[PDB]
């Protein structure tokens, strides 16, 4: 335990003497004790960057080095919790100090008082390796597995029987004297090890037809969305959290403004998990930071969230991680870089911004955990450039490493088109690798139908000049048919109502059926147009109403409705002749 | 009374003192010179060898042989009281109204603590400013930060004074029917001149609005550290009142551009490398610490609302100051030089203005059930009229349809009657009445964004409103 | 329009380069003053 | 109704004199209380 | 309407300020009558002891020549030099070892420092 | 020290139509005149010194050419002070610190000038103070800080430049002197941004303090259209407070005429965007008339000759008469346009030459000339109809 | 260079219009060249020879292959000679400074060697005063018949 005294104070910078032996990036207590970080060593001198305000400190006050870098506590008790950027539970902070966050307060991330039902799964004399399972704890209906720390080896000497214990209890003691508790600590800036990293050949089902079909993301992939005002980004994120494949949802705020963070904090406790009746928060972890909180917390929030997600997938689950605004995190990084008097690279940002963004985004993926089980982390980070320009360096750096890009647009939201993803600007890079899974699990001709729908949308979009110039009535029959088919697609397949009881979720089978119905109607209408039938007659057909109501059909009732509509489609054309 | 005389260096605004390790960092000190005059200062850096003090005023007359330094307070604090209402201060809490000092109920550090994110709640209720362009189209909700973007020659001070002496809450519209919670206005002016000072004093005295207001006035020739400290003291008083006496507080910061310039000067004086465009690299954090002190709190009936005012340097919205201010707050109100030159006051341009919390502050339990639809219909109609007015210049009026002529006349009348309200105080009902009278100029079925029931309930009124209030 | 865009980005890059040079000079002079006050003993 | 300030002036004078007379009662007690803390 | 309320409020504030200033002046005059009381040497010795203890390593002590004899005995036990000063009334000042630091312990300075804190106590004692 | 600071009520009459009408400055106010080299700051300041109605003029040549000082010294004794009729130099104090004089004395010269102005104010006079350039003062401060090895703030200037400028500019105002009398100091300061860039820190700092801002334009100076003041980028904050004085001493409806002129200029500026897009001939008749009236306003009212024996000085009533004539002509022209008269016919009307030449009429002939021109304008359309 | 040579060759006062007396005073030319190339110097020398003006011309030549620091002194020596002639022997001097850009380059080099606080584009902050101490030496003096006229030549970088 390295102890020293203060030599010089200048703003957030503190110079401590007598600190020989203190390591480079350890966490230190400054003063009576404010939490700081060592950033430089010189002889007996250590430079400490204090997280909080240093006003009122005096020369000679003690400085203590904890001897460990920034880290998080991984164990039972994180679900249904709200944390700041450095894993400080805000609920207990409020219970202690009230509405303000007084400086120098100390609380533990995991509650030391609650008792958990231990269930051993190991026997004395058994060899253990990092990542193996030692026991089991229930948590809100989940089966929490107690895992050996990644860098711990040995054989079991004794194991405690089943009962009630706190997280501080040394449940398993190795023969070399090492005691294993229900939790361990891991540095936030080191990636947790894996056995192997697998290929992206399975999809991450979002529940939204447009995202699932046109711009899919692979299980363990990455995606990015903009944040324009009025585009309904928050409801899209909530629906994604509700209807995903992920067992656990991790949400990071990283420096959002106060009122938006308040809305986020007061909306999730109201959501209901579709797979049960309980609240959605029972399998969710929240990390919230406002713009007036310390900059170091805002910078470390992203890493804390991704480390928690990595731990949860190390348990063997699938985790969805959402970053609320990476632009604010980049702003905090820029400010920290400016504090060190570093040379700016371009538009004020440090030259290593892309390296940090890559180091964050590359932790995601589907892996084989050290315990031999399979897990995955999927990251959907939002980027909100000030002014809406995509040439801003953060957006350019993000778009070079993400696998997909879902361009939210306010123009679509202005005309009540939701979820309001612009299909012209969006793209995805996982379709080619995901095609075999689509063939094996949905339908053999699914990629062909998807390509046909995309081509129809492209052709409909290519005619926007003529229709805007002269009007729709002045077009030919084929062009008018293309326009009307595009309208049918937009109003029946891409559009989705999140608040509806049955329309909120749509499997791949229902989307495939709707696409097949639309394509069949398009081909029948083209044949009828070739046989001299008028487009105005075609637009009056009753089967269009049946097609439009397809998306409000229950999942189990869908196939019969699909068969009936497919029969009606060919009936409406051939029988009339 | 500990005293220090080991001064070994004086240059610019900085002076060094030896054997002063008893001074806490950031303390406030007063420097006494040979003639007996006392001037203040603040500790910038303290070490074993010497401490660095930045002097508030100029360093004329100081010498290394006679001057001495004494401690005043370890941490800058302000003595607040419930009787500060009706008083004027100079930015460091010193009365300048000619009245005796207040007795402090307590003393609080001006660098307040951050609010707990789990202790906030959703802003829900609105404030009536008496300006129809703001109340109807850019509604101000309690707990919001809605800045005003101004120009160089535009009359932002007049708008600030009018809002200060007209703003009020409307409890009877929410069904309460009781004026239980008082309303107070905290006015902070940074880097103003003598003319603006006299104007503000006259405006707050002539209408009796001083009886419910606290004024922190910092002139342009005052020390820049006072300019730094003024908003923090104003917000400390506002938070104290709101969260210890259940007040509804509206805070107005007169010029944030002066604050940013003073911050840049202070940062340069301490030998710090600037950031983008020569501004301090931590300017975003400082602005956030100022702005994020407003809001509403779960379990409390008080509220804090901020209306920052800033002049865009070159009428450029990409300048760091407006860029960060808009990146922190929840919208903006934009002043227009074209409207100002055309003789329209207040010159507020509705098209680039935006309020991001308006939807929460309007509805059926508050204001009126047709508020939002009327607002967006007015927005679309005005945009269409402005677009048509540009084409009528070249293609002539007779080549236009009848609906385009209707839109042109509507735009002209909207500018002439809605925005140009002068020094009048319009309630929300009067503003909605004028809005419906203007919308009645359009055809019955042209109001495409409004539901049928509201149209049948309010359409058809004629223009007899601005003539009744000369 | 594309020509005006090119002019705008050219001027932006010139101004950013000048700002970077000025920051380099400021760092130089700060290092020199610190070195002077240190080595003067 | 333009001479309505006379009532307020009389009220203000009355309340000022009432405050002065109320405070004059414990003048010596207040002096002693503060002088107790002033002395070492 | 509001003018009358503002006028009555400012009249009340002026009355409160005047009575507080009267209390301040009375206390200031009372502290000037202290040296004639028999306990003056005792209290000045206590003040000098406090000032010296607050400044470790003090090399000198300065006071009024009239107050000089009372502290002569205390000078011997503390082992510090003493010197005369006509200006230093109602208080005693201790000079640090290097002479750069000074500690002034005078009744007027103590009153000025403590009046800010004691104003609330005086007000709540006067008006209940 | 003084007793009290008073509100601005009376205007500072510079004798220039554009400044005295569109962008007035009150007695005790502050104004700034930035602009690139060759724009005409020096001529404007000399005209202000020659024709303004201050009792005492203090001219401070902080770092400018010595030929300006020699011009003042040679010319002023031959001119007459408008108030008392004596020689012009008998009311002038001249502080000179030329370009090649020692650099460190520029700040001293500025302070000496302002202190002398304050003293003459304390005697109860109305004093006008004119600093030839504060940018030279800023450059001197930058040089001294470079010698001191300080840390520059922006473009090399010391951090306290803004504070020094504010302290200098805040001594202006109308006061009650310690002797019970009333006096004022008016400060007009010139700025010389490097390269004509108004984003320069000195100009930005000055922009936040002064109550009036008279920006000069290079394009107008190239055309030799003087005083070459950019109307788009100029403003004045004293306009509202001076309305009662204008109503009392100039005319009852003078502010309405000023507002009408400003609105016409605003409409012309708005139409210029379309004109530069499609050409002036694509507009309708009303827009063409607005463009022509704006051109007439620019070339017949705002324009002024500093070297003419009559056009050099213009009283408020003369400007009021000229703008009244212009507005009457515009109203008659639009009425004629509504009746189908071609725009080219209106431009050839002979009264336009009379309106254009009205600026050269002396102050004694003008009252009759105005009536004759008004009757001619009425006849040219109403009697012609 | 051609314009400067033509002005020097053709310049003359017109006493007949002004009625100042048919004094007909020829101009004396002081020619200072800073960092001048051989081509320009050869052109100027040949022009002055052809016009027969070298009999009343003082030349200070600093060629482009000459040391760069000497340019700090050349204009000052030239103007000292011009002032002496004009205000001590009643000559009418015309001063031509070939290129002030090279003078500014030398000034910037000296300032950067001393690490002065620069102005815009690296030039020293005292460059305004430095140039003013050179330009302001021309004019006419009361009570004397001499005169100094300056025609500096400078090339704007990138126009
Ligand atoms: N109001 C004016 N009337 C006539 N000529 C003018 C006027 N203003 C400027 N000029 C001309 O333009 C020149 C501008 O020079 P000067 O006033 O010294 O400019 P600056 O102050 O920018 O250095 C004058 O010498 C004169 O020839
Ligand atoms: Mg000039």
Long-range contacts of E39-43 (CB under 8 A, 24+ apart): E40/E70, E41/E67, E41/E70, E43/D39, E43/D40
B348/B418 Cα distance (integer angstroms) = 11
B226/B215 Cα distance (integer angstroms) = 14
Tell me how many helices (H) and strands (E) chain G has: 6, 4
- Taking CA atoms, B166 is separated from A99, B127, B212, B246, E60, in Å, by 31, 10, 12, 21, 65
CA dihedral A269, A270, A272, A277 (to 10 degrees): 90
D12 has a chain E CB within 8 A of its CB: yes
In the numeric block, which tokens belong to residue B180? 């239980």
F164/B268 Cα distance (integer angstroms) = 15
In the numeric block, which tokens belong to residue E27? 């206390």
F135/F200 Cα distance (integer angstroms) = 10
In the numeric block, which tokens belong to residue F107? 């700040």
Atom 14 of ligand 1, nearest CA residue: F40
Long-range contacts of A174-183 (CB under 8 A, 24+ apart): A174/A128, A178/A152, A178/A154, A180/A134, A180/A148, A180/A149, A180/A152, A181/A75, A182/A75, A182/A76, A182/A116, A182/A118, A182/A137, A182/A146, A183/A73, A183/A74, A183/A75, A183/A76, A183/A110
What is the F61 CA–ligand 2 centroid distance (Å)?
Answer: 9
DSSP characters over B209-269: GGGGEEEEEEETTS-HHHHHHHHHHHHHHHHHHHHHH--EEEEEES-HHHHHHHHHHHHHH
Please answer whether residues A387 and A226 qualify as being in contact, where contact means their C-beta atoms are separated by less than 8 angstroms: no
- Chain A positions in Cβ-Cβ contact with residue C23 (cut-off 8 Å): 343-344
B174/G136 Cα distance (integer angstroms) = 77
Residue of B nearest to C15 (CA): B277
In the numeric block, which tokens belong to residue F172? 């202006």
In the numeric block, which tokens belong to residue B44? 């910038």
Atom 19 of ligand 1, nearest CA residue: F40
- Taking CA atoms, G12 is separated from G20, G23, G27, G86, G94, in Å, by 14, 11, 8, 17, 11
DSSP characters over F338-382: HTT--HHHHHT-THHHHHHHGGG--TTTHHHHHHHHHHHHHIIII
Interface with D, mutate which of E2, E12, E15, E128 (most D CBs under 10 A): E15
F204/F222 Cα distance (integer angstroms) = 25
Residue B186's DSSP bridge partners are B214, B251
Q: Collapsing DSSP states into helix, strand and coil, what is residue A568?
A: helix
The experimental method is cryo-EM
Name which of F321, F328, F340, F337 is nearest F376 in CA terms.
F328
- Taking CA atoms, E86 is separated from A131, B117, E42, in Å, by 83, 62, 20
Give residue A366's region: left, alpha or beta (phi > 0; psi -120 to 50).
beta
Report chain breaks in chain D, C–N > 2.5 Å, as residues after which they occur. Answer: none
A423/F54 Cα distance (integer angstroms) = 71
F343/F330 Cα distance (integer angstroms) = 12
Name which of G154, G139, G143 is nearest F99 in CA terms.
G139
How many other C-beta atoms can be found within 10 angstroms of the C-beta atom of residue F115? 12
CA angle F318, F322, F328 (to 5 degrees): 140
- Chain B positions in Cβ-Cβ contact with residue F198 (cut-off 8 Å): 314
CA angle B304, B305, B306 (to 5 degrees): 125
Q: Collapsing DSSP states into helix, strand and coil, what is residue C21?
A: helix
Tell me how many helices (H) and strands (E) chain A has: 17, 26
Strands A318-323 and A248-252, bridge-based pairing: parallel
Q: Which residue has the tokens 């009339």?
A: A576
Across the C:G interface, residue pairs with CB atoms under 8 Å apart total: 4
What is the F40 CA–ligand 2 centroid distance (Å)?
Answer: 7
Cis peptide before A445 (omega within 30 of 0): no
Pocket perturbation via mutation, ligand 1, pick of F40, F132, F191, F230 by most ligand atoms within 8 A of CB: F40
How many other C-beta atoms can be found within 10 angstroms of the C-beta atom of residue C21? 13
Residue of C nearest to B278 (CA): C19
Task: Give phi and psi for A83, each to the nearest 5.
Answer: -125, 165
F313 CB within 6 A, ligand 1: no
Task: Give phi and psi for A51, each to the nearest 5.
Answer: -65, -40
Listed by start position, the domains of chain B span 1-459
Please answer whether residues B310 and B322 qualify as being in contact, where contact means their C-beta atoms are separated by less than 8 angstroms: yes
How many other C-beta atoms can be found within 10 angstroms of the C-beta atom of residue A431? 19
B296/B293 Cα distance (integer angstroms) = 10
What Å resolution does this PDB entry report? 3.2
- Taking CA atoms, G120 is separated from F202, G101, G117, in Å, by 14, 15, 10
Residue A349's DSSP bridge partners are A346
F45/F64 Cα distance (integer angstroms) = 13
- Taking CA atoms, F231 is separated from F142, F214, G31, in Å, by 32, 8, 45
Atom of ligand 1 nearest to the CA of F41: 21
Size (chain F), residues: 385
Sheet of A179-180: strand order equals: A127-128, A154-159, A172-174, A179-180
Atom of ligand 1 nearest to the CA of F35: 22
Task: Give phi and psi for A164, each to the nearest 5.
Answer: -100, 130
Tell me how many helices (H) and strands (E) chain E has: 4, 4
Q: Which helix (H) or strand (E) holds E91?
A: strand E91-95
D39/A474 Cα distance (integer angstroms) = 101
Longest dimension (CA), chain B: 87
D37 is in an annotated binding site: yes
Name which of B269, B212, B226 is nearest B52 in CA terms.
B269
Name which of B347, B192, B335 is nearest B256 in CA terms.
B192
A404/B48 Cα distance (integer angstroms) = 56
Task: Give phi and psi for F119, each to the nearest 5.
Answer: -65, -45
Q: What share of chain B is helix, strand, coil (3-state, %, to 5)?
A: 35, 25, 40
- Chain C positions in Cβ-Cβ contact with residue A344 (cut-off 8 Å): 20, 23
In the numeric block, which tokens belong to residue F190? 């010139």
Provide the CA B237 distance to its chain's centre, in angstroms: 15
Give residues with Cβ within 8 angstroms of B3, minimum separation 6. B68, B69, B70, E101, E102, E103, E104
CA dihedral B309, B310, B316, B320 (to 10 degrees): -110
F183 CB within 6 A, ligand 1: no
CA dihedral B292, B298, B302, B305 (to 10 degrees): 30
In the numeric block, which tokens belong to residue F260? 């009408």
Atom of ligand 1 nearest to the CA of F46: 17
In the numeric block, which tokens belong to residue F16? 């220039």
In the numeric block, which tokens belong to residue E18? 């005047």
Annotate A121-132 with b (16+ C-beta within 10 A) or e (fewer). ebeeeeebeebb
Residue A560's DSSP bridge partners are none
- Chain A positions in Cβ-Cβ contact with residue C27 (cut-off 8 Å): 341, 343
A475/A488 Cα distance (integer angstroms) = 18
F8/A11 Cα distance (integer angstroms) = 45
Residue F60's DSSP bridge partners are F95, F131
- Taking CA atoms, F307 is separated from B403, E14, F215, F311, F312, in Å, by 56, 63, 22, 8, 6
How many other C-beta atoms can be found within 10 angstroms of the C-beta atom of residue A24? 11
Q: Which helix (H) or strand (E) holds E106?
A: strand E101-106
Q: What share of chain C is helix, strand, coil (3-state, %, to 5)?
A: 95, 0, 5
B110/G8 Cα distance (integer angstroms) = 73
Give residues with Cβ within 8 angstroms of A111, minimum separation 6. A77, A92, A167
* Exposed / middle / buried, residue A333 (Cβ in 10 Å: 0-12, 13-18, 19+): buried
Please answer whether residues G137 and G148 qualify as being in contact, where contact means their C-beta atoms are separated by less than 8 angstroms: yes
Give residues with Cβ within 8 angstroms of F222, minimum separation 6. none
B228/B260 Cα distance (integer angstroms) = 9
F193 CB within 6 A, ligand 1: no
How many other C-beta atoms can be found within 10 angstroms of the C-beta atom of residue E112? 14
Give residues with Cβ within 8 angstroms of A574, minimum separation 6. none
Name which of B353, B356, B255 is nearest B308 in CA terms.
B255
F227 CB within 6 A, ligand 1: yes
CA atoms in the 13 A half-sphere facing the CB of B417: 25
F327 CB within 6 A, ligand 1: no
Cis peptide before F276 (omega within 30 of 0): no
Please answer whether residues F120 and F58 qualify as being in contact, where contact means their C-beta atoms are separated by less than 8 angstroms: yes
Residues bordering ligand 2, an ion, CB closer than 5 Å: F 41-42
Taking the CA of residue G133 and the nearest CA in chain F, the distance in Å comes to 5
């Amino acid at each position: 335990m390295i102890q020293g005294v203060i030599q010089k104070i200048a703003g957030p910078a503190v110079i401590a003497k007598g600190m020989l032996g203190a390591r480079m990036y350890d966490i230190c207590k400054v003063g009576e004790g404010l939490v700081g970080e060592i950033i430089r060593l010189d002889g007996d001198t250590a430079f400490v960057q204090v997280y909080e305000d240093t006003s009122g400190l005096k020369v000679g006050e003690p400085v203590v080095s904890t001897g460990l870098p920034l880290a998080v506590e991984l164990g039972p008790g994180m679900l249904n919790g709200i944390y700041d950027g450095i894993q400080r539970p805000l609920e207990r902070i409020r219970e202690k100090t009230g509405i303000y966050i007084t400086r120098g307060v100390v609380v533990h991330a995991l509650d030391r008082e609650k008792k958990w039902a231990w269930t051993p799964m190991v026997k004395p004399g058994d060899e253990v390796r990092g990542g193996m399972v030692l026991g089991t704890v229930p948590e809100f209906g989940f089966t929490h597995k107690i895992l050996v720390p990644p860098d711990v080896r040995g054989r079991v000497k004794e194991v405690k029987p089943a009962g009630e214990y706190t997280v501080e209890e040394p449940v398993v003691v190795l023969e070399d004297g090492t005691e294993l508790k229900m939790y361990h600590t891991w540095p936030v800036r080191r990636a947790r090890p894996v056995q192997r990293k697998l290929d992206p050949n399975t999809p991450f089902l979002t529940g939204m037809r447009i995202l699932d079909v046109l711009f899919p993301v692979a299980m363990g992939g990455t995606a990015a969305i903009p944040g324009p005002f009025g585009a309904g980004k928050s409801v899209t994120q909530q629906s994604l959290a509700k209807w995903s494949n992920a067992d656990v949802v991790v949400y990071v705020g990283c420096g959002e403004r106060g009122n938006e963070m308040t809305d986020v904090l007061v909306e999730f406790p109201e959501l209901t998990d579709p797979k049960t009746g309980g609240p959605l928060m029972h399998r969710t972890v929240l990390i919230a930071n406002t713009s007036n909180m310390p900059v170091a917390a805002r910078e470390a929030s992203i890493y804390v969230g991704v480390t928690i997600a990595e731990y949860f997938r190390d348990q063997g689950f699938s985790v969805a991680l959402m970053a609320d605004s990476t632009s604010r995190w980049a702003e905090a990084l820029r400010e920290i870089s400016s504090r060190l008097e570093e040379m700016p690279a371009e538009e004020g940002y440090p030259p290593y911004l892309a390296a940090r963004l890559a180091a964050f985004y590359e932790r995601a993926g589907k892996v084989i955990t050290l315990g031999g089980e399979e897990g995955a982390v999927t990251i959907v980070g939002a980027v909100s450039p000030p002014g809406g320009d995509m040439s801003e360096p953060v957006t350019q750096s993000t778009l070079r490493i993400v696998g997909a890009f879902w361009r939210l647009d306010a123009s679509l939201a202005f005309r009540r088109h939701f979820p309001a993803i612009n299909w012209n600007g969006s793209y995805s890079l996982f379709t080619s690798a995901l095609d075999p899974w689509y063939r094996e699990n949905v339908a053999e001709d699914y990629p062909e139908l998807r390509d046909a729908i995309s081509e129809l949308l492209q052709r409909e979009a290519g005619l926007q000049e003529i229709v805007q110039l002269v009007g729709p009535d002045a077009l030919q029959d084929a062009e008018r048919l293309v326009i009307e088919v595009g309208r049918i697609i937009r109003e029946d397949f891409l559009q989705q109502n999140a608040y509806h009881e049955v329309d909120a979720y749509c499997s791949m089978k229902k989307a495939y059926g709707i696409m097949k119905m639309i394509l069949a109607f398009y081909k029948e209408a083209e044949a009828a147009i070739k046989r001299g039938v008028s487009i105005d007659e075609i637009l009056q057909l009753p089967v269009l109403e049946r097609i439009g109501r397809a998306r409000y059909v229950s999942e189990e009732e869908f196939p019969a409705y699909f068969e009936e509509a497919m029969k009606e489609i060919q009936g409406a054309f051939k029988a009339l002749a | 009374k500990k005293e220090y005389t080991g001064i070994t260096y004086i240059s610019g605004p900085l002076l060094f003192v030896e054997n002063a390790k008893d001074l806490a960092y950031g303390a406030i000190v007063d420097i006494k010179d040979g003639t007996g005059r006392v001037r203040g200062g603040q500790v910038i850096e303290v070490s074993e060898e010497y401490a660095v003090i930045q002097v508030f005023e100029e360093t004329t007359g100081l010498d290394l042989a006679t001057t001495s330094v004494s401690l005043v307070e370890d941490v800058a604090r302000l003595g607040v009281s419930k009787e500060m209402l009706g008083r004027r201060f100079n930015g460091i809490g010193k009365p300048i109204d000619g009245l005796p000092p207040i007795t402090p109920e307590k003393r609080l550090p001006i660098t307040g603590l951050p609010l707990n994110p789990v202790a906030r709640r959703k802003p829900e209720q609105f404030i009536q400013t008496g300006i129809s362009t703001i109340d109807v189209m850019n509604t101000l909700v309690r707990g919001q930060k809605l800045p005003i973007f101004s120009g160089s020659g535009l009359p932002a001070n007049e708008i600030a004074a009018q809002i200060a002496r007209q703003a009020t809450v409307r409890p009877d519209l929410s069904g309460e029917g009781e004026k239980e919670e008082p309303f107070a206005v905290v006015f902070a002016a940074m880097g103003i001149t003598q003319r603006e000072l006299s104007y503000f004093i006259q405006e707050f005295e002539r209408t009796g609005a001083l009886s419910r207001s606290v004024l922190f006035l910092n002139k342009a020739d005052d020390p820049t550290i006072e300019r730094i400290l003024t908003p923090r003291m104003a917000l400390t008083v506002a938070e104290y009142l709101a969260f210890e006496h259940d007040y509804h507080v509206l805070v107005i910061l007169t010029d944030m551009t002066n604050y940013c310039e003073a911050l840049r000067e202070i940062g340069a004086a301490r030998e710090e490398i600037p950031g983008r465009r020569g501004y301090p690299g931590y300017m975003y954090t400082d602005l956030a610490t100022i702005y994020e002190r407003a809001g509403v709190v779960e379990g409390k009936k008080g509220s804090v609302t901020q209306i920052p005012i800033l002049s865009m340097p070159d009428d450029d919205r990409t300048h760091p100051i407006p860029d960060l201010t808009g990146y922190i707050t929840e919208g903006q109100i934009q002043l227009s030089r074209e409207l100002h030159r055309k003789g329209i006051y207040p010159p507020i341009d509705p098209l680039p203005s935006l309020s991001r919390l308006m939807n929460n502050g309007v509805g059926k339990g508050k204001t009126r059930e047709d508020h939002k639809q009327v607002s967006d219909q007015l927005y679309s109609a005005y945009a269409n009229g402005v677009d048509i007015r540009k084409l009528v210049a070249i293609i002539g009026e007779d080549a236009l349809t009848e609906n385009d002529r209707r839109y042109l006349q509507f735009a002209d009348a909207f500018e002439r009657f809605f925005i140009n309200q002068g020094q009048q105080n319009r309630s929300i009902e009067e503003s909605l009445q004028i809005a419906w009278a203007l919308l009645s100029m359009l055809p019955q079925g042209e109001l495409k964004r409004i539901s049928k029931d509201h149209i049948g309930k309010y359409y058809g009124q004629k223009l007899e409103e601005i003539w009744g209030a000369p | 329009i594309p020509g005006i865009r090119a002019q705008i980005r050219f001027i932006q890059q010139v101004l950013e380069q000048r700002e970077r040079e000025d920051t380099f000079r400021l760092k130089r002079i700060k290092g020199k003053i610190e070195a002077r006050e240190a080595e003067e003993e | 109704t333009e001479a309505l300030l006379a009532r307020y002036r009389e009220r203000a004078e009355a309340e000022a004199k009432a405050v002065r007379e109320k405070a004059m009662a414990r003048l010596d007690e207040a002096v002693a209380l503060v002088l107790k803390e002033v002395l070492p | 309407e509001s003018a009358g309320e503002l006028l009555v409020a400012t009249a009340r504030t002026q009355a409160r300020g005047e009575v507080l200033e009267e209390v301040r002046r009375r206390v200031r005059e009372a502290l000037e009558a202290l040296p004639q009381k028999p306990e003056w040497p005792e209290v000045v010795r206590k003040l000098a002891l406090e000032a010296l203890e607050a400044l470790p390593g003090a090399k000198a002590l300065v006071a009024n020549p009239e107050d000089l004899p009372h502290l002569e005995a205390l000078a011997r036990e503390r082992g510090v030099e003493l010197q005369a000063e006509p200006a230093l009334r109602l208080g005693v000042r201790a000079v640090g070892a290097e002479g750069k630091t000074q500690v002034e312990n005078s009744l007027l300075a103590r009153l000025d420092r403590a009046w800010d804190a004691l104003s609330s106590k005086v007000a709540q004692a006067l008006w209940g």
